[PDB]
């Protein structure tokens, strides 16, 4: 614990503070103007995630090509999941807290296609408050999402990886026990939370093909930052042939 370390404490303090979208609301809102701003925001969050990833105890020890394969596969999972947490802890509505200087309210919610997509996102935020997921449970789950998707033929450093993943699985278990202690449903909850994790593959699948659509469709006004553009241009291939292995806690 103190003597040495908890991974969940060493995490809670590598956890990135919110970034400000830099949105100017002195002007009317629009579908394009929002999505484009979010993408821009997304690019900065992902850079704020690249650090996080390397500052994750155990991460920097994988094969270079692995550590970036992981970030490339799961950046959406990280962004979407952290989206929920901000919405949850910051607000409470079927809204979304992308930044303190940018919140999609039921007003912006009603924009052209704004909600078609804001859908799958809203979801993750629902569960987190439903299961009253705790900051300690959330932080472990978020790490596990980074470690949720690998190349179809496994990583290069598969052994070391499998070892790290299991560590944070146990850390998640630790979190569940260390909340209240009413063991009664602890294993119940562990089942649930890892079920949540498994379902993030779904929400990512959907959020990703819309990311890909807005990125290929040059009629829409949506623009992407350099950082995201490179990651996306690299992922559209893989996701358009089949090189991907989605890890599951329950092959139900």
């Amino acid at each position: 614990p103190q003597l040495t370390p908890t991974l969940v404490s060493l995490l809670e303090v590598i956890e990135p503070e919110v970034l400000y979208a830099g949105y100017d609301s002195s002007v009317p809102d629009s579908t394009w103007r929002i999505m484009t701003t979010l993408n821009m925001l997304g690019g900065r969050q992902v850079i704020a995630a690249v650090k996080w990833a390397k500052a994750i105890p155990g991460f920097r020890n994988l094969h270079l090509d692995d550590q970036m394969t992981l970030l490339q596969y799961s950046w959406m999972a990280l962004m979407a999941f952290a989206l929920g947490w901000r919405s949850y802890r910051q607000s409470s509505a079927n809204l979304l807290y992308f930044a303190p200087d940018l919140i999609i309210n039921e007003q912006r919610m009603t924009l052209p296609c704004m909600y078609d997509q804001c859908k799958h996102m809203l979801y993750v935020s629902s569960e987190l408050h439903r299961l009253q997921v705790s900051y300690e449970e959330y932080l472990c789950m978020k790490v596990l999402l980074l470690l949720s998707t690998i190349p179809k033929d496994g990583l290069k450093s598969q052994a070391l990886f499998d070892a790290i993943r299991m560590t944070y699985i146990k850390e998640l278990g630790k979190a569940i026990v260390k909340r209240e202690g009413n063991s009664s449903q602890n294993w119940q909850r562990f089942y649930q939370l890892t079920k949540l994790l498994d379902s993030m593959h779904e929400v990512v699948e959907n959020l990703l093909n819309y990311c890909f659509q807005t990125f290929l469709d040059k009629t829409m006004s949506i623009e992407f930052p350099e950082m995201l553009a490179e990651i996306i241009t690299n992922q559209i291939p893989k996701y358009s042939n089949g090189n991907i292995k989605k890890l599951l806690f329950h092959q139900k």
Binding site: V50, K54, L71
Partner: peptide, 12 residues
């Protein structure tokens, strides 16, 4: 490729 690989592999 390029952009991402650089960012991690360093050592603040």
């Amino acid at each position: 490729n390029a952009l991402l690989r650089y960012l991690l592999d360093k050592d603040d």
